Amino acid sequence: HHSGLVKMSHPSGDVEACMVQVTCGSMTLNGLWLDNTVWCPRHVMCPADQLSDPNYDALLISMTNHSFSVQKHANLRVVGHAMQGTLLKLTVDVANPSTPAYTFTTVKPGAAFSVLACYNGRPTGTFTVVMRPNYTIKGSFLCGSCGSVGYTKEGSVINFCYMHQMELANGTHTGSAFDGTMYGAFMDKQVHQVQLTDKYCSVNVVAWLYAAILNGCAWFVKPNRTSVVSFNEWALANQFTEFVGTQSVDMLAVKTGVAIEQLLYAIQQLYTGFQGKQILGSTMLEDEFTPEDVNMQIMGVVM
Amino acid sequence: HHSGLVKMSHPSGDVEACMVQVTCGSMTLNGLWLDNTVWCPRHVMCPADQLSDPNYDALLISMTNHSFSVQKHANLRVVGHAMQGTLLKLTVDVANPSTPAYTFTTVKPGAAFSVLACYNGRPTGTFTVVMRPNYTIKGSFLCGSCGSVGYTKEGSVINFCYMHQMELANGTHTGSAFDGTMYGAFMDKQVHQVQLTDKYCSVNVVAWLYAAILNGCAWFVKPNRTSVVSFNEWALANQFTEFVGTQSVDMLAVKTGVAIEQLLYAIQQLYTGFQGKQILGSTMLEDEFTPEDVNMQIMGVVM
Numbered sequence: 001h002h003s004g005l006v007k008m009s010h011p012s013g014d015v016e017a018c019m020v021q022v023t024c025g026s027m028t029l030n031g032l033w034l035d036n037t038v039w040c041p042r043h044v045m046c047p048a049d050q051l052s053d054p055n056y057d058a059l060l061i062s063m064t065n066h067s068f069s070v071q072k073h074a075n076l077r078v079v080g081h082a083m084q085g086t087l088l089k090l091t092v093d094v095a096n097p098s099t100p101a102y103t104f105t106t107v108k109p110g111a112a113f114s115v116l117a118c119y120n121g122r123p124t125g126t127f128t129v130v131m132r133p134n135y136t137i138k139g140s141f142l143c144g145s146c147g148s149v150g151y152t153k154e155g156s157v158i159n160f161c162y163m164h165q166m167e168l169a170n171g172t173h174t175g176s177a178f179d180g181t182m183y184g185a186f187m188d189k190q191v192h193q194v195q196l197t198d199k200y201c202s203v204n205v206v207a208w209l210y211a212a213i214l215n216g217c218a219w220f221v222k223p224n225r226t227s228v229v230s231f232n233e234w235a236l237a238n239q240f241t242e243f244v245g246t247q248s249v250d251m252l253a254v255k256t257g258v259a260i261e262q263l264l265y266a267i268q269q270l271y272t273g274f275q276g277k278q279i280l281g282s283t284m285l286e287d288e289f290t291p292e293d294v295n296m297q298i299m300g301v302v303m
Numbered sequence: 304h305h306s307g308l309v310k311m312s313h314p315s316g317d318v319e320a321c322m323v324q325v326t327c328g329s330m331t332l333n334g335l336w337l338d339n340t341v342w343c344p345r346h347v348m349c350p351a352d353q354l355s356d357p358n359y360d361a362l363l364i365s366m367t368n369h370s371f372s373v374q375k376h377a378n379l380r381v382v383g384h385a386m387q388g389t390l391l392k393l394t395v396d397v398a399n400p401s402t403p404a405y406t407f408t409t410v411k412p413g414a415a416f417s418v419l420a421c422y423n424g425r426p427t428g429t430f431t432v433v434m435r436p437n438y439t440i441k442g443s444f445l446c447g448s449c450g451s452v453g454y455t456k457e458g459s460v461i462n463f464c465y466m467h468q469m470e471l472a473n474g475t476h477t478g479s480a481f482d483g484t485m486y487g488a489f490m491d492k493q494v495h496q497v498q499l500t501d502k503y504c505s506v507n508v509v510a511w512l513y514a515a516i517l518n519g520c521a522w523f524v525k526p527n528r529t530s531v532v533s534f535n536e537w538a539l540a541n542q543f544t545e546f547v548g549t550q551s552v553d554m555l556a557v558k559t560g561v562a563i564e565q566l567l568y569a570i571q572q573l574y575t576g577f578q579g580k581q582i583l584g585s586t587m588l589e590d591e592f593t594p595e596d597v598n599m600q601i602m603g604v605v606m
């Protein structure tokens with residue numbers, strides 16, 4: 001009756017030890033301290049009368065090293081400063097003694113990551129989200145949360161993928177990769193911005209339907225099959241992502257004995273209606289769990 | 304369109320530094336190391352041929368101090384051992400140098416807490432759950448997760464409320480308070496056990512309907528009111544908890560200008576059907592968010 005699925009985040013201790021507070025006299029937000037570097041959103045340089053159309057190149061030239069105040073909850077003297085896209089790269093006199101093994105990587109639509117929400121450099125909560133097909137996330141962020149970071153963990157290595165920047169008109173959120181790009185077409189300017197349509201993440205729905213089978217729920221499984229190619233043509237007219245299978249999904253097909261194409265056909269039928277039935281206690285398709293989530297939490301398999 | 308509500312856990316770093324591995328030669332599970340004490344489930348003493356009907360008093364007498372192996376990922380020499388209800392209280396030679404300020408407290412149905420899931424003493428994930436009215440939680444726990452701990456945080460103080468013990472036939476979970484009692488009527492014996500009916504947590508549904516209003520969603524609000532007394536009589540015949548208002552809920556009534564009794568009436572009407580409409584993207588009543596969750600994540604208010 002219970003799927004055994006929860007929104008599961010990584011333990012956050014490693015990342016908590018990397019969070020600092022950064023201020024410029026106007027805004028206060030959070031930075032990520034690794035080795036001798038502190039990363040933070042560049043709109044820390046903005047006075048609040050210019051958040052709608054800043055000239056960041058000019059604001060940056062106007063700063064010097066002691067323009068930036070970096071504190072831990074210590075004071076970290078800034079000895080170098082630079083701008084990469086929508087992030088600042090501050091250089092500090094002290095190497096973080098608790099720097100974890102880490103990489104920077106970009107997360108793809110449908111993938112889950114863990115977020116450490118911070119205010120004034122103080123971590124206050126953790127949660128997990130999936131990158132939506134329109135490069136937003138359905139987060140929980142208030143004023144002062146910018147600089148909060150998202151990350152995945154492979155083994156002992158932390159793969160930082162997100163630095164929080166802003167909220168959109170519809171309540172969702174977006175931010176930067178650590179190459180300084182914003183996800184999607186977004187700009188770090190407090191103005192109305194076009195928003196791309198969101199879509200169902202077809203791979204994650206398939207994962208969820210497998211999770212239902214692994215919990216004894218399979219009324220929706222019929223011998224009928226939709227091929228991947230046919231499903232993807234259907235997908236395009238129904239605001240579903242195109243499906244791309246993975247080894248993680250294949251393992252789920254092996255364990256249950258149910259082929260991907262059976263579940264692609266089931267999504268097509270379920271999209272038009274659950275006929276009053278429930279799947280894992282839901283009457284709507286669920287796309288916030290990944291194949292890796294289902295393999296890990298139900299089957300006991302990382303990879 | 305997006306509620307700004309996520310399942311939000313506490314940052315887990317403080318508790319990660321307290322987790323150890325405990326073994327007796329049969330089972331390996333997790334313990335919680337605070338000052339000179341290590342807490343762990345008592346069925347670490349069981350050989351796997353006796354998990355269905357152990358004699359814990361006799362197993363305990365049969366143990367000595369070096370029967371228990373406690374390791375951190377160190378070795379902590381056990382110098383004392385005792386049993387409190389369904390937990391063991393091991394005394395070790397070394398005080399945990401990172402013991403947080405803490406209390407032990409019991410969590411009540413409807414209240415949310417954070418869980419650190421651990422295997423072999425290694426923290427592997429964090430998530431948050433509400434204690435169901437039948438004293439289970441809808442967790443994510445596999446073999447070797449016993450000893451994983453649940454906790455709330457008031458200020459800097461960690462209020463430990465849960466040590467994981469077992470899974471039930473229906474996929475939900477339960478465990479001990481740190482006074483050694485199991486929640487509800489449950490026993491730490493691997494046998495079939497009666498399960499109490501679960502119910503909607505009426506206070507948390509009200510919280511959720513307030514969260515909808517705070518996000519511009521209020522079609523369900525009518526001038527009609529159901530008094531608390533009348534709602535609670537209704538509650539008893541419909542598998543809802545009886546409603547008990549709090550200051551947290553009152554603040555939500557103040558902010559929105561919508562009285563509790565309007566929402567009690569709305570639950571009664573919504574219970575019988577959403578008439579095809581959605582609330583915060585859901586066609587079912589939602590009871591996994593507390594008034595404190597809505598105050599914190601949407602309104603910015605702790606208390």
Ligand SMILES: *[C@@H](O)[C@H](C[C@@H]1CCNC1=O)NC(=O)[C@H](CC(C)C)NC(=O)OC[C@H]1C[C@@H]1C1CCC(F)(F)CC1
Pocket residue numbers: 029043046051052141142143144145146147165166167168169173187188189190191192193
């Ligand atoms: C961190 O500094 C801060 C986090 C935001 C604040 C509230 N929730 C969050 O996630 N970031 C900002 O305040 C940024 C700063 C810019 C220079 C990038 N701005 C916003 O997030 O603005 C809030 C948008 C929802 C407001 C609004 C924007 C104009 C509009 F389009 F017309 C209507 C929507």
Ligand SMILES: *[C@@H](O)[C@H](C[C@@H]1CCNC1=O)NC(=O)[C@H](CC(C)C)NC(=O)OC[C@H]1C[C@@H]1C1CCC(F)(F)CC1
Pocket residue numbers: 332346349354355444445446447448449450468469470471472476490491492493494495496
């Ligand atoms: C930690 O040691 C372990 C965590 C469990 C394992 C799987 N998921 C979890 O949360 N705890 C146990 O294995 C306990 C040990 C007892 C001495 C308390 N036992 C169980 O959790 O048993 C699993 C129950 C689901 C099994 C079953 C029980 C008999 C039944 F009722 F007939 C049918 C249901």
